[PDB]
Design an enzyme around this catalytic site. Structure first.
Site, short mmCIF file in Angstrom:
data_model
loop_
_atom_site.label_atom_id
_atom_site.label_comp_id
_atom_site.label_asym_id
_atom_site.label_seq_id
_atom_site.Cartn_x
_atom_site.Cartn_y
_atom_site.Cartn_z
CD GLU A 117 -22.84 -27.95 -22.61
OE1 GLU A 117 -23.18 -27.75 -23.65
OE2 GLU A 117 -22.10 -28.62 -22.24
N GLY A 257 -24.46 -23.33 -31.44
CA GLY A 257 -24.41 -24.23 -32.71
C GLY A 257 -25.81 -25.37 -32.52
CB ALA A 258 -27.12 -27.79 -32.31
CG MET A 259 -27.87 -27.26 -25.43
SD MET A 259 -26.28 -27.49 -25.06
CE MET A 259 -26.52 -28.86 -23.52
CD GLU A 260 -25.12 -31.65 -25.19
OE1 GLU A 260 -25.24 -30.96 -25.96
OE2 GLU A 260 -24.24 -31.97 -24.31
CG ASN A 261 -31.07 -28.36 -24.07
OD1 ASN A 261 -30.36 -28.09 -23.27
ND2 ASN A 261 -31.74 -27.88 -25.03
CG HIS A 293 -22.13 -33.37 -31.77
ND1 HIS A 293 -20.74 -33.45 -31.92
CD2 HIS A 293 -22.27 -32.41 -30.85
CE1 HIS A 293 -20.26 -33.04 -30.93
NE2 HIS A 293 -21.26 -32.24 -30.05
CD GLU A 294 -25.59 -30.76 -30.43
OE1 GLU A 294 -25.54 -31.39 -29.43
OE2 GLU A 294 -25.08 -29.96 -30.90
CG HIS A 297 -23.91 -34.61 -26.85
ND1 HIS A 297 -22.79 -35.02 -25.93
CD2 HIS A 297 -23.63 -33.34 -27.60
CE1 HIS A 297 -21.70 -34.07 -26.52
NE2 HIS A 297 -22.35 -32.97 -27.30
NA NA Z 1 -21.50 -21.34 -23.79
ZN LIG Z 2 -21.19 -31.70 -28.29
#
Ligand code: NA
Ligand SMILES: [Zn+2]
Ligand code: NA
Ligand code: NA
Length: 866
Positions: A117, A257-261, A293-294, A297
């Site tokens: 993303e 930060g972190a990511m919701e894949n 949060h992740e 999502h």
């Molecule tokens: Na970015």
């Molecule tokens: Zn988010």
């Protein structure tokens, strides 16, 4: 770099329904084979335009025919003369070890991992890299077994095998169609914490947390928070996880930060690893927030995604609202509300007053990674919270249910979400939609009148949003403006008019309007904009005694904190003007008494006391001024702390000692008493020197947890106590091998009030624990200096700007996303005096002239220099 505009959205000429990826992985040269099933939806003669960046194309086939009707252009592979339905096969090469931007497939230590993303998948293969193209992915990963024993992608493992020459492979399948920004791949050697969560309908989910070898001691709190997040989303929103495995991988090198894949979240290890000697209470609650949060999502982002990137707030405002509701239900709702309001008024308002101002749904973007902002996230969540205030919880949940029933499995828009809320609740949100299209902070001015002949109280409320650099035209918003009226005993007066109750959320929808309330039997003290009911600046002519009355009597803890902030604001403004004329702090005795009363009140929640006893930060203070004097603000904050330390010395020491806890627990009652004890320690550090040096060095050495050790170390640096250099060297000697722990120490060095702070910071570029290759170290040393030590960053000799230009000159080539976060303090030049604006404009002109200036920095510099 050209701008893209929201109003140019059009449905794609081609869709991809299914993609089967193979990665022949190697850090120097990875070969990607991508077989996509495509369908044309547009005109017969329209070519397929695929996005791609920094790819080496090996071959293009259409239904297994080597294709000749194609060309590469900047950013794209354009393929002509296609059938209506066909199989596209692309082979291309990429080089993860060359990827210092950490966008696409890259290396984090010895692991390979992805960040896709917003537009990172086009750095992996040529594709329709836009979030309204949803496809079912299958991913086969082939790699050296010794170097990469775990090969992970989204979904479930469907195939695995061993090959010659020490290689092996695994294939994954994710049944839910997704945009490519949710693709993830991880390869590496990890320790794995494994657990299970069973959903309320009985689905068993395997939970797997992958961490670098040797870090399993720091993994259980993240795993606990994941289970807490899954339970809460079932209890509060009725949502269950939808897959069989939930993986999280903690990596050290990560920008976002972190990511919701889907099913394979990738987190910066700052938001996973914690143990009581390395992490503070705030680290534990940030891990709880970001794990939550992740996970949230999964529904608000993954099962319903975004039609285009101008709709980012559709998933980020709503998912930040969900993470704040999760933290507030599990912990202290008033402390969470207070901290989110300090971020709104102290950091987000600054962005809405800057050259980068934008509505929470932007209309124009050059580099979409520049729009992962306080506005889209935190103001976006305030907008969702205003829908929740207008509708109430039951109608808001009906709106959530209608949104998923309509849009599950698709890419949707902000407007679709507001439509679902309006249709489920029957509340008209047509005027409310203007909060998505209008940037800047509204200013709401309130005048009042009490008429004793008629027992009526009238509020005359006006609003305006000043023009911003992006929009010359502004119009009134639908502002939910919550009030409470208090009689002389501190009881709430019923709101009514004409013999009917009146709801206490007033709908402020005009430029000016009047509200009249009847049967107001005593002249009221109003509490206005309760719980910060809209993200606006409030103008009301408070007396000091109305505010100290609310600190003693207001029913919601947030209003007692907010009244203390309004009381301090008047005296911060008084004392910054005095500082500019060389005069010392002045503070009325009755203001120090109101804080004394908070210390000694046995009935107040320690959580609320601690926040009233935490002064506004220098960034909160800056937003009280049109032109910021950062040296006056920093020295007035110090003088105010010394003055309250002297006036309240005996009460601060009594409450400090009364809140001692021998056991350390990550439990909200214990965290509240500790936050109050360390709020008292901060003032005591600025009291008499010998007592301060003894209290602070004893707490550092006797602490049984990092919250108390770091509160003492931070007080030693802030008050420049004799013990400071010994404690700082002790911490380096103990912790230099642990980068996350050293980040706290770099932030204390960068934010130090010492006269030689910039020299110290420059020297720490060579520190054993620092490296320009790691975004966390860059943010903790360089970002903290520019963003969190504005007094030093804005030194009158211009040295802070020159230092930032040197660091951005490196980072512009290495990692433009980190560079664009770090330039933010320089783009605020029009808030400063003319001589600082001159120097900051010269620094921005120097960066505008860089060879190979990134789009990320170009967009910010051109807006700043306009
Ligand atoms: Na970015
Ligand atoms: Zn988010
Ligand atoms: Na709570
Ligand atoms: Na009045």
């Amino acid at each position: 770099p050209q701008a893209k505009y929201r109003h140019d959205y059009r449905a794609p000429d081609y869709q991809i329904t299914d993609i089967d990826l193979t990665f022949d992985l190697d850090a120097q040269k990875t070969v990607v084979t991508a077989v996509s099933q495509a369908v044309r939806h547009g005109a017969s003669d329209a070519p397929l335009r695929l996005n791609g960046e920094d790819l080496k194309l090996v071959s293009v086939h259409i239904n297994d025919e080597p294709w000749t009707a194609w060309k590469e252009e900047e950013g794209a592979l354009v393929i002509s003369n296609l059938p209506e339905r066909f199989t596209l096969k692309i082979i291309n090469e990429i080089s993860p070890a060359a990827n210092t931007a950490l966008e696409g497939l890259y290396q984090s230590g010895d692991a390979l991992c992805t960040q896709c993303e917003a537009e990172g998948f086009r750095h992996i293969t040529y594709y329709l890299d836009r979030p309204d193209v949803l496809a079912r992915f299958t991913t086969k990963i082939i790699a050296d077994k010794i170097k990469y024993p775990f090969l992970l992608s989204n979904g479930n493992r469907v195939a695995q095998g061993e090959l010659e020459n020490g290689r092996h492979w695994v294939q994954w399948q994710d049944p839910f169609p997704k945009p490519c920004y949710l693709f993830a791949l991880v390869a590496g050697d990890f320790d794995v914490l494994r657990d299970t969560f069973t959903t309320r309908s009985g689905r068993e989910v395997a939970l797997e947390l992958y961490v670098d070898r040797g870090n399993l001691d720091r993994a259980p709190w993240a795993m606990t928070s994941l289970k807490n997040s899954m339970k809460w989303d079932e209890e509060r929103f009725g949502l269950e996880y939808d897959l069989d495995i939930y993986m999280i991988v903690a990596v050290d090198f990560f920008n976002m930060g972190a990511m919701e894949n889907k099913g394979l979240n990738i987190f910066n290890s700052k938001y996973v690893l914690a143990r009581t000697d390395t992490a503070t209470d705030k680290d534990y609650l940030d891990i709880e927030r970001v794990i939550g949060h992740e996970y949230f999502h999964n529904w608000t982002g993954n099962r319903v995604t975004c039609r285009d990137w101008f709709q980012l707030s559709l998933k980020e405002g709503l998912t930040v609202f969900r993470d704040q509701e999760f933290s507030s239900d599990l912990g202290s709702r008033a402390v969470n509300r207070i901290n989110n309001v300090r971020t709104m008024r102290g950091l987000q308002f600054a962005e809405d007053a800057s050259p980068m101002a934008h509505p929470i749904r932007p209309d124009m973007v050059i580099e979409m990674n520049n729009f992962y902002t306080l506005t889209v996230y935190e103001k976006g969540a305030e907008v969702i919270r205003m829908i929740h205030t207008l509708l109430g919880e039951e109608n808001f949940q009906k709106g959530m249910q209608l949104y998923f029933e309509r849009h599950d499995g698709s890419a949707a828009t902000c407007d679709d979400f507001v439509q679902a809320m309006e249709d489920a609740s029957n509340v008209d949100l047509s005027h409310f939609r203007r909060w998505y299209s209008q940037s800047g902070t509204p200013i709401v001015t309130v005048k009042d009148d009490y008429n004793p002949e008629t027992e009526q109280y009238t509020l005359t409320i006006s609003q305006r949003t000043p023009a911003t650099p992006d929009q010359a035209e502004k119009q009134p918003l639908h502002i939910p403006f919550a009030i409470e009226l208090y009689d002389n005993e501190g009881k709430v007066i019923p709101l009514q008019k004409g013999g009917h109750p009146v709801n206490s959320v007033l709908n402020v929808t005009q430029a000016e309007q009047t509200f009249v309330f009847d049967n107001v039997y005593f002249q009221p003290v109003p509490a206005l904009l309760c719980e910060f009911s809209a993200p606006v600046k409030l103008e009301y002519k408070w007396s000091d005694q109305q505010l100290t009355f609310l600190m003693r009597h207001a029913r919601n803890d947030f209003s007692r904190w907010d009244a203390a902030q309004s009381l301090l604001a008047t005296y911060i403004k008084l004392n910054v003007a005095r500082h500019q004329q060389g005069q010392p702090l002045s503070l009325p005795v009755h203001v120090a008494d109101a804080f004394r009363a908070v210390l000694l009140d046995e009935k107040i929640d320690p959580a609320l006391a601690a926040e009233i006893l935490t002064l506004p930060s220098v960034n909160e203070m800056a937003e009280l001024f049109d032109i910021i004097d950062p040296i006056a603000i920093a020295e007035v904050r110090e003088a105010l702390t010394r003055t309250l330390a002297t006036e309240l010395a005996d009460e601060l020491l009594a409450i400090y000692n009364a809140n001692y806890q021998s056991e350390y627990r990550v439990e909200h009652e214990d965290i509240a008493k500790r936050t109050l004890r360390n709020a008292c320690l901060r003032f005591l550090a600025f009291g008499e020197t010998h007592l301060a040096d003894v209290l602070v060095s004893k707490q550092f050495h006797e602490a049984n947890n990092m919250t108390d050790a770091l509160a003492a170390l931070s007080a030693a640096v802030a008050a420049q106590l004799p013990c400071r250099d010994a404690l700082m060297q002790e911490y380096d000697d103990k912790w230099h091998q642990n980068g996350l722990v050293m980040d706290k120490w770099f932030i204390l060095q960068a934010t130090s009030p010492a006269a030689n702070v910039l020299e110290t910071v420059r020297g720490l570029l060579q520190h054993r624990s620092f490296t320009m290759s790691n975004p966390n170290r860059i943010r903790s040393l360089i970002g903290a200096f520019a963003g969190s030590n504005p007094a030093a960053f804005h030194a009158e000799d211009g040295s802070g700007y020159l230092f930032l230009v040197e660091m951005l000159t490196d980072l512009n080539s290495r990692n433009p996303q980190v560079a664009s976060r770090l330039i933010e303090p320089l783009i605020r030049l029009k808030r400063y005096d003319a001589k600082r604006q001159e120097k900051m404009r010269a620094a921005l002109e120097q960066l505008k002239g860089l060879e190979n200036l990134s789009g990320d920095l170009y967009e910010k510099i051109t807006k700043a220099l306009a």
